[PDB]
């Protein structure tokens, strides 16, 4: 169980002087998604490569999934899985139209639910809970990444979490809680005028999974 964010430990969005669109776009409509697919190739020993066609824009045909280590690559090598995650193009590299991502891989077989499960996200502004909304999934074991994407996306559409220029919120962190043990991700970019999408998305490379029935989600925001 990770301890909660200290004072100062969270990134402040007013100290990011680049355009927030660079963060918005990773949690907007478009994401990588596939059901019951096998890796077709491999570049480095800690990645696997999938043939997944982008239905919406056709920006990609092959997706490189990068993991934190070799043992994660070997577990899911040649096994039929589901893929879900946030992809990037800038500084994405391997070896028709390509894209990169981290983790987001879960076995397909035995992991399917007959009907979608609802997880209730709880949103706090300056310590006070203002609202709740549900996010749906049909997996027994779902990656934290998928649930993060679905929660931020809602927030982007309805709360203007990430806009073109900046955000109405100063800090933000999404907290996941499985029974007793919790962990969190910082929802804001690093300070300065540029935003490294690759480097930010790498936090998902451990492929962390939660149980869809047990897990609790809490987003803590701070206003300006």
């Amino acid at each position, epitope marked *: 169980s990770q301890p909660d964010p200290k004072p100062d430990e969270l990134h402040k969005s007013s100290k990011f*002087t*680049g*355009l927030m*669109e*660079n963060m918005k*776009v990773l949690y*907007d*409509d*478009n994401h990588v998604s596939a059901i019951n697919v096998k890796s077709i190739d491999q570049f480095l020993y800690f990645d696997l490569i999938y043939s997944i066609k982008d239905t*919406k*824009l*056709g*920006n990609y045909d092959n997706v490189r999934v990068e993991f934190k280590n070799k043992d994660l690559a070997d577990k899911y090598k040649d096994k039929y899985v589901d893929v879900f995650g946030a992809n990037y*193009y*800038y500084q994405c590299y391997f070896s028709k*139209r390509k894209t990169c991502m981290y983790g987001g891989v879960t076995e397909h077989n035995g992991n399917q639910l007959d009907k979608y499960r609802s997880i209730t996200v709880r949103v706090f502004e300056d310590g006070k809970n203002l609202l709740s909304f549900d996010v749906q999934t049909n997996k027994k074991k779902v990656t934290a990444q998928e649930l993060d994407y679905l929660t931020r996306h809602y927030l982007v559409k309805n709360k203007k979490l990430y*806009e*073109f*220029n900046n955000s109405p919120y100063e800090t933000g962190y999404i907290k996941f809680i499985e029974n007793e043990n919790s962990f969190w991700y910082d929802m804001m970019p690093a300070p300065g*005028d*540029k935003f490294d999408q690759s480097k930010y998305l790498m936090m998902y490379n451990d492929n962390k999974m939660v149980d869809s029935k047990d897990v609790k989600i809490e987003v803590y925001l701070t206003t300006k």
Partner: antibody, heavy 121, light 108 residues
Framework: QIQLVQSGPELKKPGETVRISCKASGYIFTIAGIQWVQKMPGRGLRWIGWINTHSGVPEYAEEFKGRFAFSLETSARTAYLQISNLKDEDTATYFC??????????????WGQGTSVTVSS | DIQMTQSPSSLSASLGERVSLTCRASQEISDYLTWLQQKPDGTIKRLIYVASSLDSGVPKRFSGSRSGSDYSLTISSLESEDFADYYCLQYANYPWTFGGGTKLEIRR
């Protein structure tokens, strides 16, 4: 290097649809979106909206919603604008412009040469 | 919606005159401002970006500055090709909106 080239003039009729293209070259297309602007004869510039080439999410000005639509073909590095129920007031020049938000110096940095649409029966 | 009042709408000048277009925001816009030029030709190019920075391959004589909610474009010494239209534009929030434009014509 970086250049946006638009398609030629169009002479359409009232009620017909038209499709103006804006082909970009000299950069990886997914790094920057494309905006559209209307120039009417003898009057100022008017913002139609833009579209993010990663993600695909469009943003339109209220007065152009419902009849003006943004579309893409990314493998061709090409942005389309489509206008539906053509009207006399749609007669104007249309310009595309690069929205490279990855750098603070890239908003509307490179412009297209413009496309003329004339609506008459 | 952010209204961008651009003044004056017509300006009369001569060769070598220092001139100054002002453009005011009805709401806080914080340096998200850009100046554009449209020639009689029709062609449009960006002049100034982030309110005060000169666009690459636009001559020194062009500059831009801020004074609160008051934004301005300055041309230190007019050449012939400069007698064109000039528009400011805010992209601080949606919809992005254009100033009414200034037309720069020659005195006689």
């Amino acid at each position: 290097q970086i250049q946006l080239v638009q398609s030629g003039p169009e002479l359409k009729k009232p009620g017909e649809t038209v499709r103006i293209s804006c082909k970009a070259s000299g950069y990886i297309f997914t790094i920057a979106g494309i905006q559209w602007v209307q120039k009417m004869p003898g009057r100022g510039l008017r913002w139609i909206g833009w579209i993010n080439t990663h993600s695909g999410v469009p943003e339109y000005a209220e007065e152009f919603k419902g009849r003006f639509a943004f579309s893409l073909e990314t493998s061709a590095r090409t942005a389309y604008l489509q206008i539906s129920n053509l009207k006399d007031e749609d007669t104007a020049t249309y310009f595309c412009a690069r929205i490279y938000y990855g750098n603070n110096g890239g908003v509307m940095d490179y412009w297209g040469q413009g496309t003329s649409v004339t609506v008459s029966s | 919606d952010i209204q961008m009042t651009q003044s004056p709408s017509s300006l009369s000048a001569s060769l070598g005159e220092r001139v100054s277009l002002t453009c005011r925001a009805s709401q806080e816009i914080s340096d998200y401002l850009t100046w554009l030029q449209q020639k009689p030709d029709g062609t449009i190019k960006r002049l100034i970006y982030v309110a005060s920075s000169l666009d690459s391959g636009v001559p020194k004589r062009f500059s831009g500055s801020r004074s609160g909610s008051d934004y301005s474009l300055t041309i230190s010494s007019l050449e012939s090709e400069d007698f064109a239209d000039y528009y400011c534009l805010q992209y601080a929030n949606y919809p992005w909106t254009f100033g009414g434009g200034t037309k720069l014509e020659i005195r006689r």
